């Protein structure tokens, strides 16, 4: 009874993606509605199908919306990228970093504090300690919003740096610059396009 209703809802959303997206003012909203439904209702009943459908839907969303310049600094869009990285790329630093680099190259999220906070966190966890600091400072120099929160994120990070006895001896900036040079789209994007 529940499973059947859930399956009809899945097909209803899939049809809407085919029929309705093209004419929408806010096509991102339809993807968001569907992803929220999958991650709550659908995955609670069928975790293995739900995982696959969530991953595919998120990839479709990113691919469909990515070349629409109007969405470049939409915080809702940014969050989908970061959810994707966290859910699906967490065991893969290179693909995670490549995703952030691809976004950076396309100007996705580059005016939003969250982008720099999350990208810095990735580098921090990977022990690129001073590159992670420079990335936060880069966000501030690009006038990213919310600005004050970014400044507090940087302050808290400097506190973590002191707890590990870390200071410079500008190579960290040049090291970050080297890390930021765009090379290739992440594999999940390339695989989607070729499939």
Numbering used by the authors: 31 to 199, 204 to 229
Quoted passage from the original study:
The interaction of the central mitotic checkpoint component BUB1 with the mitotic kinetochore protein Blinkin is required for the kinetochore localization and function of BUB1 in the mitotic spindle assembly checkpoint, the regulatory mechanism of the cell cycle that ensures the even distribution of chromosomes during the transition from metaphase to anaphase. Sequence comparison of BUB1 and BUBR1 shows that these proteins share a common architecture: a conserved N-terminal region, a central nonconserved region that contains the binding region for other mitotic checkpoint components such as BUB3, and a C-terminal serine/threonine kinase domain. The N-terminal region mediates the binding of Hs-BUB1 to the mitotic kinetochore protein Blinkin (a protein also commonly referred to as AF15q14); the interaction is essential for the kinetochore localization of this protein and its function in cell cycle arrest induced by SAC activation (Kiyomitsu et al., 2007). The structure shows that a divergent triple tandem arrangement of the TPR motif constitutes a suitable structural framework for the physical linkage of BUB1 to interacting partners.
The crystal structure of the N-terminal region of Sc-BUB1(29-230) from budding yeast was solved at 1.74 Å resolution, and contains two molecules of BUB1 in the asymmetric unit, related by a noncrystallographic two-fold axis, forming a homodimer. The two protomers are associated primarily by hydrogen bonds and van der Waals interactions and involve clusters of conserved residues E52-P57, M98-K109, and R175-R182. Salt bridges between the oxygen atom of residue D53 of one protomer and the nitrogen atoms (NH1, NH2) of R179 and R182 of the other, as well as between D55 of one protomer and K109, R175, and R179 of the other, contribute further to the stability of the homodimer. The structure of the Sc-BUB1(29-230) protomer consists of ten α helices (H1–H10) that contribute three major features: a single α helix (H1), a tandem repeat of three units of the tetratricopeptide (TPR) motif (H2-H7), and a C-terminal region encompassing three α helices (H8-H10). Each TPR unit (TPR1, TPR2, and TPR3, numbered from the N terminal) comprises two antiparallel α helices, arranged as a helix-turn-helix hairpin. The uniform arrangement of neighboring α helices gives rise to the formation of a right-handed superhelical structure with a continuous concave surface on one side and a contrasting convex surface on the other. The amphipathic helix 8, which encompasses residues Y177 to M194, has the features of a “capping helix. Helices H9 and H10 lie parallel to the long axis of the TPR core, establishing extensive polar contacts with TPR helices H3, H4, H5, H6, and H7. The analysis of the crystal structure of Sc-BUB1(29-230) strongly suggests that the impaired interaction between these Hs-BUB1 mutants and Blinkin is due to the disruption of stabilizing interactions among α helices of the TPR units.
